[PDB]
Every structure is written in structure tokens, then in C-alpha cells.
Design a protein around this ligand. Structure first.
Ligand SMILES: [Mg+2]
Ligand SMILES: [Mg+2]
Ligand SMILES: [Mg+2]
Ligand SMILES: [Mg+2]
Ligand SMILES: [Mg+2]
Ligand SMILES: [Mg+2]
Length: 68
RNA sequence: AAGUGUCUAAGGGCGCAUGGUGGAUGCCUUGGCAUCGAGAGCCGAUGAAGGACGUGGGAGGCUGCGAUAUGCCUCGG
């Protein structure tokens, strides 16, 4: 996901997509452990996306770029 | 019969030849030392200096970072 395209998410579906990012990092972690995923770049990407969501969520309630 | 009369190397010495060991010498250098000219002269309870433990697809160290973890966002190049 991109910082710009995760701006149209207003206030709660942004947290809900943070939740599914956490869930998919979970499952991708599990397939790392069991060796059943081929592209291991995916958890780097997902971790970065979780960081992106957390960052944007922090800016919105610190007082920057808020809006639905 | 009397007599003179070489030669031998178990090993060793000396000199060569040919190797080994070793890391001197020479020539270097992502390291130092001494300065000069400019800067900046403080950091910390808004938690410092410095660390521990973690963090990467692969084990460890360094280095970076802090569960947002070799990373997140924005503005520039
Ligand atoms: Mg030398
Ligand atoms: Mg002062
Ligand atoms: Mg390494
Ligand atoms: Mg390492
Ligand atoms: Mg946190
Ligand atoms: Mg840019």
C-alpha cells in the first residue's frame, strides 16, 4: 500500500487494514516457519506497510494531514 | 726374507649445488602522529552519556535501527 492511497481510508478502516496487515504478517510468519512460502520479501513488505499505517495514524492524531 | 708402497668412512669437517624453514629487507597501505585554517562549543527528567536485549531470508560479529526495529513519513537533491 502507498501513503497516498491509504489517505482516503478515513479513521477506522485504516485501523481495520492495520489489523489485516497484522493478520497477514502472522500467517506469512507461520509459512516462513513451516517453509511453505517462496517469496520471502513479502514479510519485509508487510512489516513496512504496518509501519506506514502506524505512521499515518500517528500523524493524524498528532495534527497533520487529517481527514476522511 | 727384509723393505717401501695405495685403497676402505661407522661417522665428522670444509666448500659448493639444490631444497626446506623462517619472515628480515625492499616497495606499499581503507591505519596512525603532529599541526594549520575555519567551524561548533555543550548533552540531560520532553530521560542524557553509555549500555543490555532484540531487529535481516539465510549462524555470528561489525554497523544501522528499536516490537513501526539495515527500518516509517514529509520536504529537497
Ligand atoms: Mg615488511
Ligand atoms: Mg550552555
Ligand atoms: Mg550480517
Ligand atoms: Mg549479524
Ligand atoms: Mg509501539
Ligand atoms: Mg524524493
Amino acid at each position: 500500500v502507498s501513503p497516498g492511497e491509504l489517505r482516503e481510508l478515513t479513521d477506522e478502516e485504516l485501523a481495520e487494514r492495520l489489523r489485516e496487515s497484522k493478520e497477514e504478517l502472522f500467517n506469512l510468519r507461520f509459512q516462513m516457519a513451516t517453509g511453505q512460502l517462496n517469496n520471502n520479501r513479502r514479510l519485509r513488505t508487510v512489516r513496512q506497510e504496518i509501519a506506514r499505517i502506524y505512521t499515518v495514524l500517528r500523524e493524524r492524531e498528532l495534527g497533520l494531514a487529517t481527514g476522511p
